[PDB]
Amino acid sequence: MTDHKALAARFPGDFLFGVATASFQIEGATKVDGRKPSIWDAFCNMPGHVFGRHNGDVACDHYNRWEDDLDLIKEMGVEAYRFSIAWPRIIPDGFGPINEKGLDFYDRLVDGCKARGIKTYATLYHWDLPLTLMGDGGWASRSTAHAFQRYAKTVMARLGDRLDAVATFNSPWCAVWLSHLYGIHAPGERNMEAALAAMHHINLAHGFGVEASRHVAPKVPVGLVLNAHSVIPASNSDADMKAAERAFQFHNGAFFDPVFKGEYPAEMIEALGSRMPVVEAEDLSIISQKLDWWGLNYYTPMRVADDATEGAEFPATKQAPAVSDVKTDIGWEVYAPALHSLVETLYERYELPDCYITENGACYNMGVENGEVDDQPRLDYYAEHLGIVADLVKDGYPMRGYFAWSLMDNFEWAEGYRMRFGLVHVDYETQVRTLKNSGKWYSALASGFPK
Amino acid sequence: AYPMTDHKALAARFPGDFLFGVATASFQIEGATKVDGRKPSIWDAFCNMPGHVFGRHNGDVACDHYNRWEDDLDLIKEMGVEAYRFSIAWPRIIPDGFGPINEKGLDFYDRLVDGCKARGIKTYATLYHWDLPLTLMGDGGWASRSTAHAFQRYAKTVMARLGDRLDAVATFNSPWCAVWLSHLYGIHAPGERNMEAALAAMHHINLAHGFGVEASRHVAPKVPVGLVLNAHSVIPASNSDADMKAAERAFQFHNGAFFDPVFKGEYPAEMIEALGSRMPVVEAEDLSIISQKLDWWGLNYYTPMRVADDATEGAEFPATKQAPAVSDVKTDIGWEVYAPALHSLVETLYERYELPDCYITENGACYNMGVENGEVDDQPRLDYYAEHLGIVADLVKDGYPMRGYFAWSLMDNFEWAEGYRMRFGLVHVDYETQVRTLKNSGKWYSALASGFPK
Numbered sequence: 001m002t003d004h005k006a007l008a009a010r011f012p013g014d015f016l017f018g019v020a021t022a023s024f025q026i027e028g029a030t031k032v033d034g035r036k037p038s039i040w041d042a043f044c045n046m047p048g049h050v051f052g053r054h055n056g057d058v059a060c061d062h063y064n065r066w067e068d069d070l071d072l073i074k075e076m077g078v079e080a081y082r083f084s085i086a087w088p089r090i091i092p093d094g095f096g097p098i099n100e101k102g103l104d105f106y107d108r109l110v111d112g113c114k115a116r117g118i119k120t121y122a123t124l125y126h127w128d129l130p131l132t133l134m135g136d137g138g139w140a141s142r143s144t145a146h147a148f149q150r151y152a153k154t155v156m157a158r159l160g161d162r163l164d165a166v167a168t169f170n171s172p173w174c175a176v177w178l179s180h181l182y183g184i185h186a187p188g189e190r191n192m193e194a195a196l197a198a199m200h201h202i203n204l205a206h207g208f209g210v211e212a213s214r215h216v217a218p219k220v221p222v223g224l225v226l227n228a229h230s231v232i233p234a235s236n237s238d239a240d241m242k243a244a245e246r247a248f249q250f251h252n253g254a255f256f257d258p259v260f261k262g263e264y265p266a267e268m269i270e271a272l273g274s275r276m277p278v279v280e281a282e283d284l285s286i287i288s289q290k291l292d293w294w295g296l297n298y299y300t301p302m303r304v305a306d307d308a309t310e311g312a313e314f315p316a317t318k319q320a321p322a323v324s325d326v327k328t329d330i331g332w333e334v335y336a337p338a339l340h341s342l343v344e345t346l347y348e349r350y351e352l353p354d355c356y357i358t359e360n361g362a363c364y365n366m367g368v369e370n371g372e373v374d375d376q377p378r379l380d381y382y383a384e385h386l387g388i389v390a391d392l393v394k395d396g397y398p399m400r401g402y403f404a405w406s407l408m409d410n411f412e413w414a415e416g417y418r419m420r421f422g423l424v425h426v427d428y429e430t431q432v433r434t435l436k437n438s439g440k441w442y443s444a445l446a447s448g449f450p451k
Numbered sequence: 452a453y454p455m456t457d458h459k460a461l462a463a464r465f466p467g468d469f470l471f472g473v474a475t476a477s478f479q480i481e482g483a484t485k486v487d488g489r490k491p492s493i494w495d496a497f498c499n500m501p502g503h504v505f506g507r508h509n510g511d512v513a514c515d516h517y518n519r520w521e522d523d524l525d526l527i528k529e530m531g532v533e534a535y536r537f538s539i540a541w542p543r544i545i546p547d548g549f550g551p552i553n554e555k556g557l558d559f560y561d562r563l564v565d566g567c568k569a570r571g572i573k574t575y576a577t578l579y580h581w582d583l584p585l586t587l588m589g590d591g592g593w594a595s596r597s598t599a600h601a602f603q604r605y606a607k608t609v610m611a612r613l614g615d616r617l618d619a620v621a622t623f624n625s626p627w628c629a630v631w632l633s634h635l636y637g638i639h640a641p642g643e644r645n646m647e648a649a650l651a652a653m654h655h656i657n658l659a660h661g662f663g664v665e666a667s668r669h670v671a672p673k674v675p676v677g678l679v680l681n682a683h684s685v686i687p688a689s690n691s692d693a694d695m696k697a698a699e700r701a702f703q704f705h706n707g708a709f710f711d712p713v714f715k716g717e718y719p720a721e722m723i724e725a726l727g728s729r730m731p732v733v734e735a736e737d738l739s740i741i742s743q744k745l746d747w748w749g750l751n752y753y754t755p756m757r758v759a760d761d762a763t764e765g766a767e768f769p770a771t772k773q774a775p776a777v778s779d780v781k782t783d784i785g786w787e788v789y790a791p792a793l794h795s796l797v798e799t800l801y802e803r804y805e806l807p808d809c810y811i812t813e814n815g816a817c818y819n820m821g822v823e824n825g826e827v828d829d830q831p832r833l834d835y836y837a838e839h840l841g842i843v844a845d846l847v848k849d850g851y852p853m854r855g856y857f858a859w860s861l862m863d864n865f866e867w868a869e870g871y872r873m874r875f876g877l878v879h880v881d882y883e884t885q886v887r888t889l890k891n892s893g894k895w896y897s898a899l900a901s902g903f904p905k
């Protein structure tokens with residue numbers, strides 16, 4: 001289980017261990033140095049969308065504290081840091097003039113990492129769309145993909161000489177369905193037409209980003225970060241099994257199929273295709289450019305059952321109950337085997353590049369007692385899932401690295417600051433960072449690498 | 452006694468100094484949404500996001516009034532109509548809501564008002580007709596008290612430039628729409644459905660109105676200040692004690708939310724009992740600022756709001772449901788035509804509230820006929836005007852201070868969630884050619900209005 005020296009023995013000597021973070025979740029300084037609002041600033045500040053109307057004005061104050069945070073990462077002995085770049089700082093209206101002050105912040109951040117021997121994994125888009133782009137229709141408008149194309153080039157032109165890796169998007173599933181169909185994330189739409197348009201334009205923007213990054217910075221390996229869902233049927237009935245496949249096509253295939261097969265899932269196209277935006281002739285060629293790596297985000301299985309309610313929109317599924325009785329403080333089922341079956345399914349179904357676990361972590365809300373944080377269930381979560389990752393390596397899968405999700409407690413989207421995911425406790429009143437016991441344990445594991 | 456046109460008989464019923472006008476709104480007619488420093492409004496975003504507006508129609512082109520304004524003023528002049536009521540685009544004047552003033556934006560309305568003065572057309576400006584700068588959504592939009600101060604500063608900036616020539620100014624057009632329809636019902640931008648959001652919008656728009664009144668008089672004390680409201684004509688389904696109570700709750704929520712703070716310096720009591728706990732912070736000076744004396748007010752009327760008690764358990768205040776229509780006549784947008792509801796509404800308001808002079812700022816009808824042989828035969832629109840103008844003349848006879856009337860829609864235009872499909876104009880616009888064609892209703896209105904001032 002939790003014996004780190006024994007766990008470490010199961011990984012190759014060149015395995016990459018990392019910690020990860022996202023711009024709006026930690027940075028604060030929302031109106032500083034030319035930054036303009038993102039769709040999340042708007043979402044937060046409109047009553048109804050976010051717990052307690054919590055916003056990102058301060059968060060972890062990382063914009064000002066970035067040096068201490070980097071020193072913390074070095075002191076933990078962690079080889080890699082994955083962060084996202086705030087489009088609203090770089091090109092504040094989305095289109096329009098470049099904010100060189102904005103590029104400067106990430107320019108210094110990357111330099112600080114280089115000096116400290118910390119490998120840099122940058123994500124171009126982790127949900128903070130500049131608000132002004134909503135004027136054109138946001139992700140529902142194709143022009144937004146070209147705004148992204150230009151943004152991608154702008155960032156890589158400045159950073160591409162030092163970045164160890166880059167990912168275009170993190171979790172299209174959230175930016176697409178959760179944001180435009182379910183109304184849970186910004187901009188909070190609930191419309192199938194809007195969502196399908198967002199779907200294609202995000203896929204297209206990804207393809208634009210790959211291309212742009214390679215024209216300016218060909219040495220930098222390009223990736224895409226996806227929260228692929230481990231879809232588990234409620235039963236072995238034909239009904240529930242056919243449900244599981246429809247769910248897979250809609251929740252995963254909507255992104256994996258275009259990127260890795262250069263097509264949309266056919267059954268999904270039959271049901272939803274007529275409400276999709278224009279797909280120009282070169283679109284799927286651009287979307288399906290070969291990647292150097294991909295990032296898997298995993299937390300919990302997606303248990304589905306057939307939903308035979310009349311007129312139900314594709315995929316016509318409903319939530320099946322948790323088999324495990326272990327749950328995190330946000331209520332997510334803990335079931336590590338669903339990570340093994342997921343990776344197994346994906347590598348059978350698609351031609352994938354090397355894989356990095358880019359997010360895996362757990363919500364537990366204990367704070368500081370006697371200068372320490374006893375977050376044993378988080379420690380246990382990492383041990384179990386890292387064990388699975390080690391199994392996958394054994395089984396022959398190209399698992400090259402693992403990023404622990406959440407360097408520190410932060411703004412957790414619709415949950416506000418109530419749900420803590422970090423390895424490092426952050427006291428929001430004092431901004432004091434406190435390494436948790438899970439973090440001390442992860443640091444012990446990671447410190448031994450590379451061997 | 453010999454035959455007389457209806458417009459001449461009608462004209463005899465109005466006092467010699469009655470004011471006749473036509474009216475428009477900036478986003479509905481201007482187009483040119485990305486020139487001369489304009490940044491997007493919440494309606495640009497609403498239009499372009501699939502699901503909110505018919506056909507995803509937007510305001511990019513509209514009637515191209517930004518470029519054809521002189522021709523449109525000439526049309527007004529030729530119609531012999533005394534007054535022009537228009538709105539000013541905040542996204543043109545202060546593109547980010549807060550931030551640098553866009554002089555180019557101000558220049559447009561500066562030249563427009565000069566063109567009206569040069570033509571002898573009286574100018575009635577509306578400062579806000581729903582086109583909030585998109586950037587203000589970053590702070591929460593109308594749900595944030597700061598937005599009220601952003602409006603305040605915008606109002607001041609506008610009036611400092613135009614105040615020497617404007618005949619009247621209204622701060623807002625239809626709070627009901629910007630508040631409930633936009634933040635509770637989800638039908639208008641920004642399309643929220645949240646009571647907490649709506650109550651914040653409610654108070655901050657009431658507050659912004661008061662700020663605007665003070666700002667306008669500070670820098671242009673000569674200009675008469677008003678507020679334009681779509682007061683709903685609430686008609687109970689019956690005189691049962693239960694429907695009667697429903698009608699009063701409906702009145703408090705749909706009208707009193709705005710009339711009580713503005714004209715009585717307080718919110719309706721039963722509404723507070725049900726909703727007060729979810730309202731934003733009301734500071735010490737708020738209601739005295741909101742309730743400043745006005746020089747006039749504008750009534751928007753189209754159709755009645757017929758209500759019955761809604762016994763649905765747990766129903767949110769005011770807990771009413773739609774009651775059946777009495778007339779079977781409807782416009783092409785589906786609204787009951789029922790002119791006497793205008794009479795009972797003005798009666799009700801003048802007995803409940805201490806109100807200044809009244810101008811009918813919007814009255815009109817959706818009918819969609821186009822051009823045939825150079826003409827638009829829109830007799831049902833003409834009949835709507837003649838009948839409602841008869842009600843207005845009746846209200847004058849009955850002792851109410853009705854000082855003027857603006858026919859709503861000078862021209863066919865962008866109709867919000869309906870897009871360009873619903874035509875409200877006295878002037879037809881062919882959206883392919885941008886050709887204006889004065890309709891038969893418009894020629895009739897022109898013949899009436901030209902006689903004034905007598």
Ligand SMILES: O=C(O)c1ccccc1O[C@@H]1O[C@@H](CO)[C@H](O)[C@H](O)[C@H]1O
Pocket residue numbers: 022170171174227297299359412413421
């Ligand atoms: O945000 C969600 O609701 C979500 C749900 C399922 C799978 C992934 C999700 O997003 C990741 O989880 C977040 C936890 O709140 C993290 O903060 C990450 O930022 C994010 O990438």
Ligand SMILES: O=C(O)c1ccccc1O[C@@H]1O[C@@H](CO)[C@H](O)[C@H](O)[C@H]1O
Pocket residue numbers: 476624625628681751753813866867875
């Ligand atoms: O949109 C409504 O449901 C509404 C209802 C009652 C009173 C006014 C209303 O909006 C006004 O009517 C518009 C017609 O589409 C006009 O074009 C005006 O611009 C607007 O002020």
